[PDB]
């Protein structure tokens, strides 16, 4: 909630990008890490 | 050395998608 | 079905496009060029110099003038990073040689 | 004779993908 | 042969080393004082290694080649 | 990470791994000057 | 998926090897065979 | 409407004349130089290092005057004043006696200045007068060359357009004699237009020769010319390079030093460009080569202290 | 008076590295410090007479750190690997 509540409030339908932009970026990390180990 | 005969070449592909 | 049969029918180019080239070959690229320049601190070595390595061993060609790889690492990395230093090193230990100050 | 297009980046590996979060 | 390189360059190195001796002793202090802390690799490089590069350590290696007391 | 690393399991593993390679390379090359 | 179904560290190490056992040594001894002729 | 073997002696005795003259006069600026600047003028303020300097200059300028005048001469064995650039370039050395009676109209320094020069570029202005009307009645050394004529041409379109800049007062230099707080002398603005008009000979010439050799007629024949373009050149860096010795201040002053150092240092370039003979595709090849060390480099960067490329690449066969 | 020199290393600056005069106990050393936030240190630095250094403190923090984070994130796998490989293969070959 405070993750959420700082990204809405520091940075017309902008925080709704900001919010998708953060949800895409974790879960890509997330996947991006499983991978890279799981290719050795 | 993989790259360079990409410069040699110089100084001197999923076929599924198609 | 007989809708989409002949829906199919009609539009193999936009297929293609959206199934094959969209990400691939357009968005991806440019997506991977701007962000690896807007990390990758304002040198020669990390701004030119590597990306050239990294694009040709990865695409397997090097970017040349013909390429739109070339002309995007120019602009962004070079116009953007070095040349607004070099600008002034050049103004101020190259340009004294030649006539004009 | 080809036209003004990218290739594809990705037909080698994947290492690349770690470029988007990351900027992210 | 090594030690042929090494007893034709040493007469060499020694009178070059002489010579100056002015600047041969403050470019051990530059030398040794940008080697103690990697505070000049951000701007060299890009990659800032005094982050991860310990002082303490490299200083007591050398008290401990210089006295050989491991 | 070190302290991690080189922890006293994993050295004794480090160690019995070791010895049973150079016994090995050495049985191998024993019996091939046999031959 | 196509990640995890590559061949490991086993079967890597036989293909190498087994191809430095079986096309270059064994080709030179085909060659040697047929030079010099269970 | 060829040109009859009349008129081939007649211009060859004539650019051949001029040119003769042209190197005498170099030789003696040359001594004069050597010796004394108040050989050519009459006002006290003669004395100084600079003077002599520029004087060397100008006969540097002369050399290369009298070697463009040879260079007529030496076209002049095929009757080659007839393609359209050497008629642009009979013209340009038209507006060098044209533009140096201006400059003299708008100031003259010396008698002797008027004598000498309006003696060689009259000459060379009804010369070409008379032959215009003959005429009518019928890599990187281009970037070098290019690059001097920008440089020069500027350097005269700034230095013929200004009356004089103004030599700092240093406000409380011995308020006294030694000359501080003072004017710039009537000595001098005729010794600026005769550099500028040195300039301007040299833009001319380089303009030639970059036009007439842009298919590196004659391929070859600049080789006498290519002797004056360049020893002066250099021999005129040699007098800049000995002027921090004399003690002359060079870097007050915009319109006088700049383009002598400028045109002296690409002379010497010149020198290179014909030394070591830049194919416009070698210098890529040290890219190239560079280019190729640092991606080498990079790559063992990469699977070394990064990610293995045994991992990052696919693996086939299973 | 028995330092001569201190000199803030660190990436935040908060360690300083002190030089041991002749006048000190047990001849010249070379010590570190870690320090705690008291705002009072600087004075009692500069008014008796010592020499304080200062690094370059790379203003930028989110560009001076990435490349180095990279490194510490990927070299544990290539010793890990290292290790491994020189036992179970520069032996056994
Ligand atoms: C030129 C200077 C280089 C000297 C040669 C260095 C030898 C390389 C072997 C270790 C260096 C590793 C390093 O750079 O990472 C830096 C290393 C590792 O870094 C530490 O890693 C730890 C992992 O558990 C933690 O993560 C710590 O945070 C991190 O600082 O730190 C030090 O070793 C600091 C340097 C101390 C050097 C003292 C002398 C070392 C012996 C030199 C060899 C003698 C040569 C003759
Ligand atoms: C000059 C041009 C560039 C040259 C670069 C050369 C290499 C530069 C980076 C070296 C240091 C890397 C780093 O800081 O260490 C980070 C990691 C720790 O992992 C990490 O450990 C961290 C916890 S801690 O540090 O252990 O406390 C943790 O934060 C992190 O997640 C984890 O990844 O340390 C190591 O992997 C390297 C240790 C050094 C190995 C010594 C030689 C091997 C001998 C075998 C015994
Ligand atoms: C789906 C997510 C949609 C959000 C739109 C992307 C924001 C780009 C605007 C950045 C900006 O304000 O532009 C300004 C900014 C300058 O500060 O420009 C820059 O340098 C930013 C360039 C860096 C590139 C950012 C990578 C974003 C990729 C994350 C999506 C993972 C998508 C995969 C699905
Ligand atoms: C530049 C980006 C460098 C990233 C520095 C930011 C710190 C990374 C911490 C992420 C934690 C991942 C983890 O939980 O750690 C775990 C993870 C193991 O799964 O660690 C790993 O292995 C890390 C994988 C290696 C990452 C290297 C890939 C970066 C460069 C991608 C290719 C260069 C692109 C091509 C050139 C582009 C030219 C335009
Ligand atoms: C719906 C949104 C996402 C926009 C979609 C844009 C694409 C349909 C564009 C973007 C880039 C274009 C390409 C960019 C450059 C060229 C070269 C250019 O070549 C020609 O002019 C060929 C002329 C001929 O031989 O007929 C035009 C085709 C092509 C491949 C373009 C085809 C259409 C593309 C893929």
Redesign the pocket.
């Known amino acids: 909630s405070a993750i959420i509540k700082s990204i809405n409030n520091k940075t017309s339908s902008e925080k709704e990008t900001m919010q998708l932009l953060l949800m895409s970026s974790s879960i890509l990390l997330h996947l991006c890490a499983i991978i890279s180990l799981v290719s050795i | 050395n993989k790259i360079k005969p990409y410069f040699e070449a110089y100084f001197s592909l999923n076929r599924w998608s198609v | 079905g007989e809708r989409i049969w002949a829906w199919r029918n009609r539009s193999e180019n936009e297929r293609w496009f959206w199934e094959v080239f969209a990400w691939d070959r357009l968005i991806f690229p440019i997506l991977v060029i701007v962000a690896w320049e807007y990390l990758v601190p304002n040198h020669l070595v990390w701004a030119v110099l590597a990306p050239l390595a990294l694009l040709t061993w990865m695409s397997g060609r090097l970017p040349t003038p013909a390429t739109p790889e070339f002309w995007m690492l120019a602009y962004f990395g070079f116009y953007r990073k070095v040349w607004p230093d070099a600008a002034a090193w050049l103004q101020g230990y190259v340009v004294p040689l030649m006539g004009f100050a | 004779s080809l036209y003004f297009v990218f290739t594809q980046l990705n037909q080698k590996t994947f290492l690349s993908y770690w470029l988007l979060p990351v900027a992210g | 042969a090594w030690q042929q390189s090494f007893e034709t360059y040493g007469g060499k190195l020694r009178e070059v080393l002489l010579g100056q001796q002015e600047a041969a002793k403050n470019v051990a202090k530059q030398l040794d004082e940008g080697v103690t802390y990697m505070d000049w690799?951000y701007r060299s490089?890009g990659?800032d290694?005094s982050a991860?590069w310990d002082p303490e350590l490299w200083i007591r290696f050398r008290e401990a080649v210089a006295q050989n007391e491991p | 990470?070190?302290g991690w690393?080189?922890a006293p399991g994993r050295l004794e593993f480090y160690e019995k791994a070791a010895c049973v390679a150079i016994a090995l390379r050495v049985l191998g090359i024993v019996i091939a000057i046999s031959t | 998926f196509s990640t995890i179904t590559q061949p490991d560290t086993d079967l890597i190490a036989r293909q190498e090897k087994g191809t430095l056992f079986w096309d270059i040594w064994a080709d030179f001894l085909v060659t040697a065979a047929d030079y010099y002729n269970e | 409407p060829e040109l009859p073997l009349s008129t081939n002696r007649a211009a060859g005795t004539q650019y051949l004349a001029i040119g003769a003259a042209y190197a005498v006069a170099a030789g003696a600026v040359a001594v004069a130089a050597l010796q004394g600047p108040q050989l050519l003028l009459a006002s006290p303020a003669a004395a100084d290092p600079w003077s002599s300097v520029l004087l060397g200059c100008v006969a540097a300028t002369y050399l290369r005057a009298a070697g463009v005048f040879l260079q007529l001469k030496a076209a002049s064995d095929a009757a080659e004043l007839l393609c359209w650039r050497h008629q642009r370039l009979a013209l340009t050395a038209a507006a060098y006696g044209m533009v140096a009676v201006l400059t003299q109209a708008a100031g003259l320094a010396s008698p002797q200045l008027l004598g000498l020069q309006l003696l060689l570029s009259v000459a060379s202005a009804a010369v070409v007068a008379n032959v215009a009307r003959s005429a009518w009645a019928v890599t990187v050394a281009g970037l070098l060359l290019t690059t001097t004529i920008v440089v020069s041409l500027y350097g005269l379109f700034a230095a013929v357009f200004a009356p004089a800049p103004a030599l700092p007062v240093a406000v409380g230099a011995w308020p006294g004699t030694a000359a501080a707080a003072a004017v710039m002398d009537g000595s001098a603005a005729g010794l600026r237009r005769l550099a500028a008009g040195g300039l301007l000979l040299t833009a001319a010439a380089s303009h030639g020769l970059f036009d007439f050799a842009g298919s590196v007629p004659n391929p070859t024949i600049y080789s006498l010319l290519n002797l004056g373009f360049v020893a002066a050149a250099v021999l005129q860096s040699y007098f800049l390079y000995i002027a921090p010795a004399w003690g002359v201040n060079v870097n007050w002053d915009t319109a006088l030093w700049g383009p002598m150092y400028g045109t002296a240092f690409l002379g010497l370039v010149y020198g290179l460009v014909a030394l070591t003979k830049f194919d416009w595709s070698s210098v890529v090849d040290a890219v190239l080569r560079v280019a190729c060390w640092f991606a080498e480099l990079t790559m063992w960067?990469w699977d070394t202290?990064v990610w293995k490329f045994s991992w990052s690449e696919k693996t086939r066969r299973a | 008076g028995h330092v001569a020199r201190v000199r803030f290393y660190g990436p935040e600056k908060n360690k300083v590295m002190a030089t041991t005069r002749a006048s000190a106990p047990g001849g010249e050393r070379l010590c570190k410090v870690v320090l705690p936030p008291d705002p009072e240190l600087l004075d009692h630095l500069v008014s008796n007479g010592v020499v304080v250094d200062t690094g370059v403190t790379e203003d930028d923090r989110l560009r001076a750190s990435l490349l180095?984070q990279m490194?510490?994130?990927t070299?544990?796998f290539?010793?890990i690997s290292g290790?491994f490989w020189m036992i179970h293969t520069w032996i056994l070959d």
């Open positions: 690799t490089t990659v290694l991860v | 990470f070190l690393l080189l | 960067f202290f | 180095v490194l510490r994130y070299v544990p290539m010793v290790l």
